[PDB]
Amino acid sequence: SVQIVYKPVDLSKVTSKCGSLGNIHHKPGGGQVEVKSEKLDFKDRVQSKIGSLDNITHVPGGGNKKIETHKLTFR
Amino acid sequence: SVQIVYKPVDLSKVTSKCGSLGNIHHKPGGGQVEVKSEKLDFKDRVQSKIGSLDNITHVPGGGNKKIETHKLTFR
Amino acid sequence: SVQIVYKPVDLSKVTSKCGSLGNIHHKPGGGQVEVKSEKLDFKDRVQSKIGSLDNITHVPGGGNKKIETHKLTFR
Amino acid sequence: SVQIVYKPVDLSKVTSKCGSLGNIHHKPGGGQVEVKSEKLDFKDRVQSKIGSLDNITHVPGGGNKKIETHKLTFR
Amino acid sequence: SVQIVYKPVDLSKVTSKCGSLGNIHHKPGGGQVEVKSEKLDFKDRVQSKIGSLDNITHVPGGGNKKIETHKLTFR
């Protein structure tokens, strides 16, 4: 006979306290972008990005995470 | 016979306290970007990025993480 | 017979206290980027990045982590 | 004869710039005030203050001042 | 004859720049105030203050001042 008893117990705390969170300034691409092109040959795909792109200001009050994986495999 | 008793117990704390969090200044690409091109041949794919791209200001109050993996395998 | 009793016990603390956290200044790419090109031949893929890219200001109040792995394998 | 020509000229600047101003915490009278009195005689005026009084948090963005006095006196 | 020509000229600058100003913590009277009194005689005025009083947090971004006095007196 085979007897498996999977009883994981969890009393866990992921906690944060923050008194104040602020005065965040993110200023990307303040300056000047000059792009000049003359006599260009492209014989395949072109991807171009010019300026201020994909900029992030992420300010979570918590921002806490808990990943928990359980796996039982019988063969 | 086979008897497996998987009883992991967890009373765990991932904790932060912060009195104040602030006055963050992120200023990427303040200056001047001049790109001049004359007589260029491309015979395959081109990817170009010019300026201020993919800049991040990440300011979590907590920012705490707990990864926990459990794995039981019987064969 | 075979008897396995997996009882790991955890009373663990990953803790931080911080009275103040602030006045962070990140200023990447303050100066001047001049790129001049004349008579260039490319016969394969080109990737170009010019300016201020992929810059990070990461300021977590906590920033604490706990990784915990449990693995029981019977054969 | 008497000739008075009072021509004071002023081209003056009192200036401030501030990128961020914040995360001010003023916590007066956190603790415990116990006042016990038995058999007190007062034969004149009494003024009493007990606790947290007249506390100030003054946070001006500018807070700049210019005093200018002109006085001409003829006798 | 008497000829007075009061032409004071002013091209003056009182200036400040500040990139960030913050994370100020003022915590007066954290602890415990125990006042016990038995058999006190007062035959004149009493002023009493007990606890956390008249505490200031003054945080001006500028805080700049210019005093200028002009005085002309003829007799």
CSV table of C-alpha atoms in Angstrom, one decimal:
chain,number,residue,atom,x,y,z
A,1,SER,CA,0.0,0.0,0.0
A,2,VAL,CA,0.9,3.7,-0.5
A,3,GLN,CA,-0.2,6.5,1.8
A,4,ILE,CA,0.7,10.2,0.9
A,5,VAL,CA,-0.5,13.0,3.3
A,6,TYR,CA,0.4,16.4,1.8
A,7,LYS,CA,-0.5,18.9,4.6
A,8,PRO,CA,1.7,22.0,4.1
A,9,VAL,CA,0.6,24.7,6.6
A,10,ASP,CA,1.2,28.5,5.9
A,11,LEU,CA,0.8,31.4,8.4
A,12,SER,CA,2.9,33.9,6.4
A,13,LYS,CA,3.0,37.7,6.2
A,14,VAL,CA,4.4,39.9,3.5
A,15,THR,CA,3.9,43.3,4.9
A,16,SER,CA,4.9,47.0,4.3
A,17,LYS,CA,4.2,50.2,6.0
A,18,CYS,CA,5.1,53.6,4.5
A,19,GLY,CA,4.4,56.9,6.1
A,20,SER,CA,4.6,59.0,2.9
A,21,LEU,CA,5.4,58.2,-0.7
A,22,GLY,CA,5.8,61.1,-3.1
A,23,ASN,CA,7.5,63.9,-5.0
A,24,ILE,CA,8.6,61.5,-7.8
A,25,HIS,CA,9.7,63.4,-11.0
A,26,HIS,CA,10.4,61.4,-14.2
A,27,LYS,CA,11.4,63.6,-17.1
A,28,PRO,CA,12.8,61.5,-20.0
A,29,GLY,CA,13.7,63.1,-23.4
A,30,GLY,CA,14.1,66.7,-22.3
A,31,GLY,CA,16.5,67.6,-25.1
A,32,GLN,CA,16.5,67.8,-28.8
A,33,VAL,CA,16.4,64.9,-31.3
A,34,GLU,CA,17.6,65.9,-34.8
A,35,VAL,CA,17.7,63.0,-37.4
A,36,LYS,CA,18.8,63.8,-40.9
A,37,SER,CA,19.0,61.2,-43.7
A,38,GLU,CA,20.0,61.4,-47.4
A,39,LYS,CA,20.4,58.6,-49.9
A,40,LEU,CA,19.6,55.5,-47.9
A,41,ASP,CA,18.8,52.1,-49.5
A,42,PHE,CA,17.0,49.4,-47.5
A,43,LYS,CA,16.4,46.0,-49.1
A,44,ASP,CA,14.7,44.3,-46.1
A,45,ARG,CA,12.5,45.2,-43.1
A,46,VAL,CA,13.0,48.5,-41.2
A,47,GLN,CA,11.9,49.3,-37.7
A,48,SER,CA,12.4,52.9,-36.5
A,49,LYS,CA,11.6,54.6,-33.2
A,50,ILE,CA,12.4,58.3,-32.7
A,51,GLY,CA,11.7,60.4,-29.6
A,52,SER,CA,10.4,59.4,-26.1
A,53,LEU,CA,9.0,55.9,-26.1
A,54,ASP,CA,8.1,53.2,-23.6
A,55,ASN,CA,8.9,55.2,-20.5
A,56,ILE,CA,7.5,54.1,-17.2
A,57,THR,CA,6.7,55.7,-13.8
A,58,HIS,CA,5.5,52.8,-11.6
A,59,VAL,CA,4.7,53.9,-8.1
A,60,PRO,CA,2.8,51.3,-6.1
A,61,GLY,CA,2.0,51.9,-2.4
A,62,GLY,CA,2.5,48.3,-1.6
A,63,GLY,CA,4.2,46.5,-4.5
A,64,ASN,CA,4.4,43.3,-2.5
A,65,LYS,CA,4.2,39.8,-4.0
A,66,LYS,CA,4.0,36.2,-2.9
A,67,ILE,CA,4.5,33.3,-5.3
A,68,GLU,CA,3.7,29.9,-3.9
A,69,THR,CA,3.8,26.7,-6.0
A,70,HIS,CA,2.6,23.2,-4.8
A,71,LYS,CA,3.2,20.1,-7.0
A,72,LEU,CA,2.5,16.5,-6.1
A,73,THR,CA,3.2,13.9,-8.7
A,74,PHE,CA,2.4,10.1,-8.4
A,75,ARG,CA,3.6,7.5,-10.9
B,1,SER,CA,4.2,-0.4,2.6
B,2,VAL,CA,5.1,3.3,2.0
B,3,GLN,CA,4.0,6.2,4.2
B,4,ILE,CA,4.9,9.8,3.3
B,5,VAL,CA,3.8,12.7,5.6
B,6,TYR,CA,4.7,16.1,4.1
B,7,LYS,CA,3.8,18.6,6.8
B,8,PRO,CA,6.0,21.7,6.3
B,9,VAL,CA,4.9,24.5,8.7
B,10,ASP,CA,5.6,28.2,8.0
B,11,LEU,CA,5.2,31.2,10.3
B,12,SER,CA,7.3,33.6,8.4
B,13,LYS,CA,7.4,37.4,8.1
B,14,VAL,CA,8.9,39.5,5.3
B,15,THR,CA,8.3,43.0,6.6
B,16,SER,CA,9.3,46.6,5.9
B,17,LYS,CA,8.7,49.9,7.6
B,18,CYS,CA,9.6,53.2,6.0
B,19,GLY,CA,9.0,56.7,7.6
B,20,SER,CA,9.1,58.6,4.4
B,21,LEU,CA,10.0,57.7,0.8
B,22,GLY,CA,10.3,60.6,-1.7
B,23,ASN,CA,12.0,63.3,-3.7
B,24,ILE,CA,13.1,60.9,-6.5
B,25,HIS,CA,14.2,62.7,-9.7
B,26,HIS,CA,14.9,60.7,-12.8
B,27,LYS,CA,15.9,62.9,-15.8
B,28,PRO,CA,17.3,60.7,-18.7
B,29,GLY,CA,18.2,62.1,-22.1
B,30,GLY,CA,18.6,65.8,-21.0
B,31,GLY,CA,21.0,66.6,-23.8
B,32,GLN,CA,21.0,66.8,-27.6
B,33,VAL,CA,20.9,63.8,-30.0
B,34,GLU,CA,22.1,64.7,-33.6
B,35,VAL,CA,22.1,61.8,-36.0
B,36,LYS,CA,23.2,62.5,-39.6
B,37,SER,CA,23.4,59.9,-42.3
B,38,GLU,CA,24.5,60.0,-46.0
B,39,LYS,CA,24.8,57.1,-48.5
B,40,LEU,CA,24.0,54.1,-46.4
B,41,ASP,CA,23.2,50.7,-47.9
B,42,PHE,CA,21.3,48.0,-45.9
B,43,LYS,CA,20.8,44.5,-47.5
B,44,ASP,CA,19.1,43.0,-44.4
B,45,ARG,CA,16.8,43.9,-41.4
B,46,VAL,CA,17.4,47.2,-39.6
B,47,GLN,CA,16.2,48.1,-36.1
B,48,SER,CA,16.9,51.7,-34.9
B,49,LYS,CA,16.0,53.5,-31.7
B,50,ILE,CA,16.9,57.2,-31.2
B,51,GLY,CA,16.1,59.4,-28.2
B,52,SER,CA,14.8,58.5,-24.7
B,53,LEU,CA,13.4,55.0,-24.6
B,54,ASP,CA,12.5,52.3,-22.0
B,55,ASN,CA,13.4,54.4,-19.0
B,56,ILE,CA,11.9,53.3,-15.7
B,57,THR,CA,11.2,55.0,-12.3
B,58,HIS,CA,10.0,52.1,-10.1
B,59,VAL,CA,9.2,53.3,-6.5
B,60,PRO,CA,7.3,50.7,-4.5
B,61,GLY,CA,6.5,51.5,-0.8
B,62,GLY,CA,6.9,47.8,0.1
B,63,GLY,CA,8.6,46.0,-2.8
B,64,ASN,CA,8.9,42.8,-0.8
B,65,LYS,CA,8.6,39.3,-2.2
B,66,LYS,CA,8.4,35.8,-1.0
B,67,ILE,CA,8.9,32.8,-3.4
B,68,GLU,CA,8.0,29.4,-1.9
B,69,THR,CA,8.1,26.1,-3.9
B,70,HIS,CA,6.9,22.7,-2.7
B,71,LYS,CA,7.4,19.6,-4.8
B,72,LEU,CA,6.7,16.0,-3.8
B,73,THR,CA,7.5,13.3,-6.4
B,74,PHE,CA,6.7,9.6,-6.0
B,75,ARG,CA,7.8,6.9,-8.4
C,1,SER,CA,8.4,-0.7,5.2
C,2,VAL,CA,9.4,2.9,4.5
C,3,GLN,CA,8.3,5.9,6.7
C,4,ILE,CA,9.2,9.4,5.7
C,5,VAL,CA,8.1,12.4,7.9
C,6,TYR,CA,8.9,15.7,6.3
C,7,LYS,CA,8.1,18.3,9.0
C,8,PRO,CA,10.3,21.4,8.4
C,9,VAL,CA,9.3,24.2,10.8
C,10,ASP,CA,9.9,27.9,10.0
C,11,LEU,CA,9.6,30.9,12.3
C,12,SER,CA,11.7,33.3,10.3
C,13,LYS,CA,11.8,37.1,9.9
C,14,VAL,CA,13.3,39.2,7.1
C,15,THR,CA,12.8,42.7,8.3
C,16,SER,CA,13.8,46.3,7.6
C,17,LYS,CA,13.2,49.7,9.2
C,18,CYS,CA,14.1,52.9,7.5
C,19,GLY,CA,13.5,56.4,9.0
C,20,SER,CA,13.7,58.3,5.8
C,21,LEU,CA,14.5,57.3,2.2
C,22,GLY,CA,14.8,60.1,-0.3
C,23,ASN,CA,16.5,62.8,-2.4
C,24,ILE,CA,17.6,60.3,-5.1
C,25,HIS,CA,18.7,62.0,-8.3
C,26,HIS,CA,19.4,59.9,-11.5
C,27,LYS,CA,20.4,62.1,-14.5
C,28,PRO,CA,21.7,59.8,-17.3
C,29,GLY,CA,22.7,61.2,-20.7
C,30,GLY,CA,23.1,64.9,-19.7
C,31,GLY,CA,25.5,65.6,-22.6
C,32,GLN,CA,25.5,65.7,-26.3
C,33,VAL,CA,25.4,62.7,-28.7
C,34,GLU,CA,26.6,63.5,-32.3
C,35,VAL,CA,26.6,60.5,-34.7
C,36,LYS,CA,27.7,61.2,-38.3
C,37,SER,CA,27.8,58.5,-41.0
C,38,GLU,CA,28.9,58.6,-44.6
C,39,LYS,CA,29.2,55.6,-47.1
C,40,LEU,CA,28.4,52.6,-44.9
C,41,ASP,CA,27.6,49.2,-46.4
C,42,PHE,CA,25.7,46.6,-44.3
C,43,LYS,CA,25.1,43.1,-45.8
C,44,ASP,CA,23.4,41.6,-42.7
C,45,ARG,CA,21.2,42.6,-39.7
C,46,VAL,CA,21.8,46.0,-38.0
C,47,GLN,CA,20.6,46.9,-34.4
C,48,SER,CA,21.3,50.5,-33.4
C,49,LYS,CA,20.5,52.4,-30.2
C,50,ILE,CA,21.3,56.1,-29.8
C,51,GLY,CA,20.6,58.4,-26.8
C,52,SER,CA,19.3,57.5,-23.3
C,53,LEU,CA,17.9,54.0,-23.1
C,54,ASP,CA,17.0,51.4,-20.5
C,55,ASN,CA,17.9,53.6,-17.5
C,56,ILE,CA,16.4,52.6,-14.2
C,57,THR,CA,15.7,54.3,-10.9
C,58,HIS,CA,14.5,51.5,-8.5
C,59,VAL,CA,13.7,52.8,-5.0
C,60,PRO,CA,11.7,50.2,-2.9
C,61,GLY,CA,11.0,51.1,0.7
C,62,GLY,CA,11.4,47.4,1.7
C,63,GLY,CA,13.0,45.5,-1.2
C,64,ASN,CA,13.3,42.4,1.0
C,65,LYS,CA,13.1,38.9,-0.4
C,66,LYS,CA,12.8,35.3,0.9
C,67,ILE,CA,13.2,32.3,-1.5
C,68,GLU,CA,12.4,28.9,0.1
C,69,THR,CA,12.5,25.6,-1.9
C,70,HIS,CA,11.2,22.3,-0.6
C,71,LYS,CA,11.7,19.1,-2.6
C,72,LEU,CA,11.0,15.5,-1.5
C,73,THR,CA,11.7,12.7,-4.1
C,74,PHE,CA,10.9,9.0,-3.6
C,75,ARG,CA,12.0,6.3,-6.0
D,1,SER,CA,16.1,128.1,-2.5
D,2,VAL,CA,15.9,124.4,-1.7
D,3,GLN,CA,15.6,121.6,-4.3
D,4,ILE,CA,15.2,117.9,-3.3
D,5,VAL,CA,15.0,115.2,-6.0
D,6,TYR,CA,14.3,111.8,-4.5
D,7,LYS,CA,14.6,109.3,-7.4
D,8,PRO,CA,15.5,105.9,-6.0
D,9,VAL,CA,15.4,103.3,-8.8
D,10,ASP,CA,14.9,99.6,-8.1
D,11,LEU,CA,15.3,96.6,-10.5
D,12,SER,CA,15.6,93.9,-7.8
D,13,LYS,CA,14.8,90.2,-7.8
D,14,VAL,CA,14.1,88.0,-4.8
D,15,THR,CA,13.8,84.5,-6.4
D,16,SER,CA,13.6,80.9,-5.5
D,17,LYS,CA,13.4,77.6,-7.5
D,18,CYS,CA,12.7,74.3,-5.9
D,19,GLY,CA,12.4,71.0,-7.8
D,20,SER,CA,10.4,69.2,-5.1
D,21,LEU,CA,9.4,70.1,-1.5
D,22,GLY,CA,7.9,67.3,0.5
D,23,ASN,CA,7.7,64.4,3.0
D,24,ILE,CA,7.5,66.6,6.0
D,25,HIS,CA,6.4,64.9,9.2
D,26,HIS,CA,5.7,66.8,12.4
D,27,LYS,CA,4.6,64.6,15.3
D,28,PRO,CA,4.5,66.7,18.6
D,29,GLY,CA,3.3,65.2,21.9
D,30,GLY,CA,3.5,61.5,20.9
D,31,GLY,CA,3.8,60.3,24.5
D,32,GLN,CA,1.8,60.4,27.7
D,33,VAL,CA,1.0,63.4,29.9
D,34,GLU,CA,-0.1,62.5,33.5
D,35,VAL,CA,-0.8,65.4,35.8
D,36,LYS,CA,-2.0,64.6,39.3
D,37,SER,CA,-2.8,67.3,41.9
D,38,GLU,CA,-3.9,67.2,45.6
D,39,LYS,CA,-4.4,70.0,48.1
D,40,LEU,CA,-3.4,73.1,46.0
D,41,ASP,CA,-4.3,76.7,47.1
D,42,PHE,CA,-4.2,79.5,44.6
D,43,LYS,CA,-4.9,83.1,45.8
D,44,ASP,CA,-4.4,84.8,42.4
D,45,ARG,CA,-4.9,84.2,38.7
D,46,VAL,CA,-4.0,80.7,37.2
D,47,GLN,CA,-3.3,80.0,33.5
D,48,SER,CA,-2.8,76.3,32.7
D,49,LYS,CA,-2.1,74.5,29.4
D,50,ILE,CA,-1.8,70.7,29.2
D,51,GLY,CA,-1.2,68.5,26.1
D,52,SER,CA,-0.3,69.5,22.6
D,53,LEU,CA,-0.7,73.2,21.9
D,54,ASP,CA,0.4,75.9,19.5
D,55,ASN,CA,2.3,73.5,17.2
D,56,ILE,CA,3.1,74.7,13.7
D,57,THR,CA,3.9,73.1,10.4
D,58,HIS,CA,4.7,76.0,8.0
D,59,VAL,CA,5.7,74.8,4.5
D,60,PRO,CA,5.6,77.7,1.9
D,61,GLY,CA,6.8,76.9,-1.6
D,62,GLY,CA,8.3,80.4,-2.0
D,63,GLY,CA,8.5,82.0,1.5
D,64,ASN,CA,10.4,85.0,0.1
D,65,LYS,CA,10.0,88.5,1.4
D,66,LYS,CA,11.1,92.0,0.5
D,67,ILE,CA,10.7,94.9,3.0
D,68,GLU,CA,11.5,98.3,1.5
D,69,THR,CA,11.1,101.6,3.5
D,70,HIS,CA,11.3,105.1,2.0
D,71,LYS,CA,11.2,108.2,4.2
D,72,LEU,CA,11.8,111.9,3.3
D,73,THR,CA,11.5,114.5,6.0
D,74,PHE,CA,11.7,118.2,5.5
D,75,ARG,CA,11.9,120.8,8.3
E,1,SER,CA,21.0,127.5,-2.4
E,2,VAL,CA,20.8,123.8,-1.6
E,3,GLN,CA,20.5,121.0,-4.2
E,4,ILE,CA,20.1,117.4,-3.1
E,5,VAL,CA,19.8,114.6,-5.7
E,6,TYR,CA,19.1,111.2,-4.1
E,7,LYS,CA,19.4,108.7,-7.0
E,8,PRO,CA,20.3,105.3,-5.5
E,9,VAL,CA,20.2,102.6,-8.3
E,10,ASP,CA,19.6,98.9,-7.5
E,11,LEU,CA,20.0,95.9,-9.8
E,12,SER,CA,20.3,93.3,-7.1
E,13,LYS,CA,19.5,89.6,-7.0
E,14,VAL,CA,18.8,87.4,-3.9
E,15,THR,CA,18.4,83.9,-5.5
E,16,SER,CA,18.2,80.3,-4.5
E,17,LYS,CA,18.0,77.0,-6.5
E,18,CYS,CA,17.3,73.7,-4.7
E,19,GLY,CA,16.9,70.4,-6.6
E,20,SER,CA,15.0,68.6,-3.9
E,21,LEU,CA,14.0,69.6,-0.3
E,22,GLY,CA,12.4,66.9,1.8
E,23,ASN,CA,12.3,64.0,4.3
E,24,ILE,CA,12.1,66.3,7.3
E,25,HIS,CA,11.0,64.6,10.5
E,26,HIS,CA,10.3,66.7,13.7
E,27,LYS,CA,9.2,64.5,16.6
E,28,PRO,CA,9.1,66.6,19.9
E,29,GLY,CA,7.9,65.2,23.2
E,30,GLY,CA,8.1,61.5,22.3
E,31,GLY,CA,8.4,60.4,25.9
E,32,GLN,CA,6.4,60.5,29.1
E,33,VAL,CA,5.6,63.6,31.3
E,34,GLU,CA,4.5,62.7,34.8
E,35,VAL,CA,3.8,65.7,37.1
E,36,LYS,CA,2.7,65.0,40.7
E,37,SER,CA,1.9,67.8,43.2
E,38,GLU,CA,0.8,67.7,46.8
E,39,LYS,CA,0.3,70.6,49.3
E,40,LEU,CA,1.3,73.6,47.2
E,41,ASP,CA,0.4,77.2,48.2
E,42,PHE,CA,0.5,80.0,45.6
E,43,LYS,CA,-0.2,83.6,46.8
E,44,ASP,CA,0.3,85.3,43.3
E,45,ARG,CA,-0.1,84.5,39.6
E,46,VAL,CA,0.7,81.1,38.2
E,47,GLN,CA,1.4,80.2,34.6
E,48,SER,CA,1.9,76.5,33.8
E,49,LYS,CA,2.6,74.7,30.5
E,50,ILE,CA,2.8,70.9,30.4
E,51,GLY,CA,3.4,68.7,27.4
E,52,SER,CA,4.4,69.6,23.8
E,53,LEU,CA,3.9,73.3,23.1
E,54,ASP,CA,5.0,75.9,20.6
E,55,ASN,CA,6.9,73.5,18.4
E,56,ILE,CA,7.7,74.6,14.8
E,57,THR,CA,8.5,72.9,11.5
E,58,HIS,CA,9.3,75.7,9.1
E,59,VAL,CA,10.3,74.5,5.6
E,60,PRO,CA,10.2,77.3,3.0
E,61,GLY,CA,11.4,76.4,-0.6
E,62,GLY,CA,12.9,79.9,-0.9
E,63,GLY,CA,13.1,81.5,2.5
E,64,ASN,CA,15.0,84.5,1.0
E,65,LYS,CA,14.7,88.1,2.3
E,66,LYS,CA,15.8,91.5,1.3
E,67,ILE,CA,15.5,94.5,3.7
E,68,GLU,CA,16.2,97.9,2.2
E,69,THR,CA,15.9,101.2,4.0
E,70,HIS,CA,16.1,104.7,2.5
E,71,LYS,CA,16.1,107.8,4.7
E,72,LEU,CA,16.7,111.4,3.6
E,73,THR,CA,16.4,114.1,6.4
E,74,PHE,CA,16.6,117.9,5.7
E,75,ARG,CA,16.8,120.5,8.5
